Amino acid sequence: VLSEGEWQLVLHVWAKVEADVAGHGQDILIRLFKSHPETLEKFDRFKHLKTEAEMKASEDLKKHGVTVLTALGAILKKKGHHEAELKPLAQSHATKHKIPIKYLEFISEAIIHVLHSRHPGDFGADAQGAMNKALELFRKDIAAKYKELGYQG
Ligand code: HEM
């Protein structure tokens, strides 16, 4: 479990992310899609996007970057008591979207890269450590729901 001090580091940076959810959403999805091109194939709606310039220009991409960070922030702010928030998500990502756990590991690294590039002073090594723990917690709970449904992985 994260301590109360680790939760404070997490949410302190997250309140900065919430200053500009759309720009953060953008960076994180584009980092995901460039670093791990196989992830872009899961999105029928982004499949046509072939360059970084085209991704930066898509309003739909930026809109759905807000969708992802908003659902994430709702989870983070439950400081581990996230059962009602996480359940629906795992269900649709296991059974409808078919997203393996490993991809949730990729987007975790993209989130951490982008926080570091945008918020140095609030994202030192202690906060990086705390955010990695929170992201591991979220992955571990999702993985348990996956296993139950027959998708573990
Ligand atoms: C930090 C984790 C992520 C969160 C919080 C998250 C959240 C969301 C939300 C809230 C929706 C819409 C409602 C739903 O369908 O249940 C959604 C849709 C979707 N998510 Fe995610 N997601 C995340 C990670 C991923 C990743 C890593 C991928 C793919 C590599 C993925 C693929 C999808 C797809 C394919 C859809 C449907 C888009 C559409 O309707 O065209 N998700 N996700």
Swiss-Prot record:
Cellular location(s): Cytoplasm, Sarcoplasm
Coiled coil (residue ranges): none
Residues given in the record as nitrite binding sites: 64
EC number: 1.7.-.-, 1.11.1.-
Entry binding sites for O2: 64
GO molecular function terms listed in the Swiss-Prot or TrEMBL record: heme binding; metal ion binding; nitrite reductase activity; oxygen binding; oxygen carrier activity; peroxidase activity
Enzyme class: oxidoreductase
Gene3D superfamilies attached to this UniProt entry: 6.10.140.2100, 6.10.140.2110
Residues at which heme b binds: 93
Keyword Coiled coil found: no
Domain Globin span(s) in chain numbering: 1-147
Phosphothreonine PTM positions: 67
Function: Monomeric heme protein which primary function is to store oxygen and facilitate its diffusion within muscle tissues. Reversibly binds oxygen through a pentacoordinated heme iron and enables its timely and efficient release as needed during periods of heightened demand. Depending on the oxidative conditions of tissues and cells, and in addition to its ability to bind oxygen, it also has a nitrite reductase activity whereby it regulates the production of bioactive nitric oxide.
Quaternary structure note: Monomeric.
Protein family according to the UniProt entry: Belongs to the globin family.
UniProt-recorded name of the protein: Myoglobin
Species of origin: Physeter macrocephalus
